[PDB]
Amino acid sequence: ADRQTVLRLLNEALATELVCFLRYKRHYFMATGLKASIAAAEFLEHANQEMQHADQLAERIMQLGGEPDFNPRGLEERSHAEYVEGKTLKDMVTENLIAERIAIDSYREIITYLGNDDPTTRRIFEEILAQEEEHADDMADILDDLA
Amino acid sequence: ADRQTVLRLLNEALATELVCFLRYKRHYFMATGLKASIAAAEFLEHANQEMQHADQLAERIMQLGGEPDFNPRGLEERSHAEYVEGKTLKDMVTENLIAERIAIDSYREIITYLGNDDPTTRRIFEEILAQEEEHADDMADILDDLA
Ligand SMILES: [Fe+2]
Ligand SMILES: [Fe+2]
Ligand SMILES: [Fe+2]
Ligand SMILES: [Fe+2]
């Protein structure tokens, strides 16, 4: 694989995970204000899992001799997912489902781009992808009870 | 106290803690690349403590009927501390000491501004201030062994 291209894709994924962490933290706090207990619990669980994903990505960046970009200024422009506050609980759940589906689609594209060229990095994306699918299922379950 | 002014100061402190979290996470990963084990450990411990501070601040914002601003785009402009990468270990340690001293000075100013007008919020800042003093001592201890 091209080392620089893999490092850029890892840093884009890192930005995605950090944006999703911040968005889920926002939603957790707002959900506590609505007394939406299980939604809040899922938002916080998901936030901490996104930070675990960020950690795995940054560790791989270090292993490949790159530098992980945690600068908040450019995060949104490196991330495929958006930071969106929303107003209602339904808005927040919908925005998280949108973001998880974006992350899923982006990680599938990265896995295909990598092919057989960097198996270690590929497996990291495969593991994260599987957990984003669980995140999306979690959000869909809540969203269906709000429709 | 003026509720809106207290909410703004809480959101500025929240941004400060989030910037410091991101900067310490950057430094942790770079320090692992340098095999600077105890510096890395302190950077990560400090990062997770800054996120605990952020959580306490956001919880108080919710209690006062405000909204905690986790948007990464404007974080640096709301934060008194800066996100600074540095190049060497000494640079990173120095930047964290600078940032802790900034946070300490800003939190002392906030505590004086609050006076007796919002004791709950004041005590939150007092608790965080005490831990930032410990963070600064930790960084100074490392920095002196690098001088
Ligand atoms: Fe993730
Ligand atoms: Fe996710
Ligand atoms: Fe702090
Ligand atoms: Fe600190």
Numbering used by the authors:
A (entry chain A), B (entry chain A): 31 to 177
List sentences quoted exactly from the publication behind this structure:
We report the biochemical, structural, and functional characterization of the protein coded by gene PA4880 in the P. aeruginosa PAO1 genome. Our structural work shows that the product of gene PA4880 is a protein that adopts the Dps subunit fold, which oligomerizes into a 12-mer quaternary structure. Unlike Dps, however, the ferroxidase di-iron centers and iron coordinating ligands are buried within each subunit, in a manner identical to that observed in the ferroxidase center of P. aeruginosa bacterioferritin. The ferroxidase centers in Pa DpsL catalyze the oxidation of Fe2+ utilizing O2 or H2O2 as oxidant, and the resultant Fe3+ is compartmentalized in the interior cavity.
The initial protein purification strategy, which was carried out in the absence of MgSO4, resulted in a very low protein yield containing only a small proportion of dodecamer Pa DpsL. Fractions containing 12-mer were concentrated in 50 mM phosphate buffer pH 6.2 for crystallization screens. Prismatic crystals were obtained from the Proplex screen condition D5 (8% (w/v) PEG 6,000, 100 mM MES pH 6.0, 100 mM MgCl2). Structure solution and refinement produced a DpsL model (1.3 Å resolution) containing one molecule in the asymmetric unit, with electron density defining residues Ala31 to Ala171. The N-terminal residues Met1 to Ser30 could not be modeled due to conformational disorder. The Pa DpsL structure adopts a 4-helix bundle comprised of α1 (R33-G63), α2 (S67-Q93), α4 (L119-L144), and α5 (R152-L176), and the short helix α3 (L105-R108) in the middle of the long loop connecting α2 and α4. The anomalous scattering difference map revealed the presence of two large electron density peaks (36.7 σ and 34.6 σ), which were assigned as Fe ions based on the electron density maps and coordination distances. The Fe ions form a dinuclear center buried in the middle of the 4-helix bundle, where they are coordinated by the side chains of residues E47, E80, H83, E130, E162, H165, and two water molecules. The structure of the dinuclear center, which is contained within the four-helix bundle, is different from the typical architecture of dinuclear iron centers in Dps, but nearly identical to the ferroxidase center of P. aeruginosa bacterioferritin (BfrB). Taken together, the structural features of Pa DpsL, which revealed a classic Dps fold harboring a bacterioferritin-type ferroxidase center, indicate that the product of gene PA4880 is a Dps-like protein (Pa DpsL).
